[PDB]
Structure 1
């Protein structure tokens, strides 16, 4: 079954096959005295792999590359970071030193620079306005609007009906808000609606942290964000 936070030592990385040529990667990290799991995606791209998000830090991301080589044996040639925070760009330098072409939107690149986080080298154009979508190899990238962060992207894999929401989507077990210092609470439910409207066909939805589900994860996140807004 899908690996949970309690089953993954910090420093180790697990892969979970969703579909032909589609996996999530799962890692864990301490933050503020608690241990969190964290998800990203791996999508096969001919005889190469596209990586979505690092494994939250240099050590984990090196383990992630080692696990991919062991379990899959295809080269990661490009990676996309879905926003500027350390669980999505922490490890970009590891990726770059391994020869991976790292990408993020100009918004994410500017904010990472401001924050002191690692900065993906390449820039994704065409994603600066809410509702914008661009094809990137075997995925579509979508900018739904400000939500968990002003730059957050979601990623859809049309071949597998997989929607990766990143930190803009919460798992069901999370009934209170995560970090919101960088969020746009006022716009977050509207951005989720844009996701629903653009990817109504999605079958497997992956939050930034925790267990995947279906499109009900978008309603769940809306419920939680609105409850937080009101308290």
Structure 2
């Protein structure tokens, strides 16, 4: 049964196992008078743990490393940040403090620094053009073009057909868009096209916020975006 925002006090972290060596991490934060849940990904790489995205905060993130060790017992050696907002790079300093080599594209690094956000240590090359992909450990990394933001990346685990969309992918119950001051709404469904074509087998699909689903979510997300747009 997946955790929900109301089960997670602010500053605490949960883990949810999706498939052998594949988990999502969940945390909750305040963003103007309300508290929201946020998702991330953890994939086993043998003796070591690959992190996708922070827990939204230097504090939540210290609590993410705690629950990983308690519940998994392995060491996080590399983390990838899917885009440049604070639910994705916030916590990257704690991470580096505690031993992690932290990676994100050069677009992400440059945008985080202009914004006033924390900055990943190492550049990810091979993701500068729509449809580019690169292997990185036990996952694949995919830049499908502009959408939620100009630099957003998704992450596929072939060993288990888990597809992680980040904030470019909405959950089923979300019926309005909300936050888009950095989206490319026009380009966004063309970018979901590329994801659908590129991973049409995916059994599991994880959104930046909320409840997991399947490829249904790609259609569901395409629809919400074209509604915002027609109004």
TM range (shorter): over 0.9
Give 1:64 shift.
0.2
User: What's the counterpart of residue 38 of structure 1?
Assistant: 38
TM-score normalized with structure 2 length: 0.99
Q: CA deviation at 1:179?
A: 1.1
Local SS of the residue matching 2:118: coil
What CA distance in whole angstroms lies between the structure 1 residues aligned with 2:208 and 2:161? Answer: 17
Q: Equivalent residue of 1:159, what SS?
A: helix
Instruction: Give the structure 2 partner of residue 3 of structure 1.
Output: 3
Structure 1 distance, partners of 2:130, 2:215, is 20
1-side partners of 2:17 and 2:32: how far apart? 30
Distance 1:155 1:87 in 2: 16
SS state at 2:159 partner: coil
* Cα deviation, residue 48, structure 1: 0.2
Comparing 46-55 with 171-180, greater Cα deviation is found at 171-180
Distance 1:35 1:116 in 2: 22
Distance 1:82 1:33 in 2: 26
CA distance, structure 2, for counterparts of residue 178 and residue 55 of structure 1: 21
The 3-state SS of whatever aligns with 1:10 is coil
- 1:225 maps to 225
Alpha-carbon deviations, 1:60-110, whole Å to 9, x = none? 000000000000000000000000000000000010000100000000001
Q: CA deviation at 1:32?
A: 1.3
CA-to-partner distance for each residue in 1:43-71, whole Å, 9 max, x for gaps? Answer: 00010000000000111000000000000
- 1:7-39 CA-to-partner distances (Å, cap 9, x unmatched) read 111110000000100000000001011111000
Number of residues of Structure 1 aligned to a counterpart in Structure 2:
230
Q: Deviations over 1:115-174 (max 9, x none)?
A: 000000000000000000000000000000000000000000001100000000001111
Structure 2, unmatched stretches of 5+, are none
CA–CA distance in structure 2, aligned partners of residues 33 and 138 of structure 1:
39
Q: Distance in 1 between matches of 2:13 and 2:131?
A: 33
Q: d(CA) in 2 for partners of 1:173 and 1:90? A: 26
Deviations 1:163-213 (CA, angstroms, capped at 9, x unpaired): 000000001111100310000000000000100000001011000000000
Name the SS of the counterpart of 1:227 in structure 2.
helix
- After TM superposition, the runs of 4+ consecutive aligned structure 1 residues lying more than 4 A away are none
Separation of aligned partners in 2, 1:214 and 1:79: 25
| Superposition map of 1:185-200 within 5 A | 185-200=185-200
Q: Offset of 1:225 from its aligned partner?
A: 0.5
CA distance in 1, matches of 2:10, 2:172: 22
| Secondary structure of 2:218 counterpart | helix
Partner in structure 2 of residue 90 of structure 1: 90
Structure 2: distance between partners of 1:210 and 1:45: 26
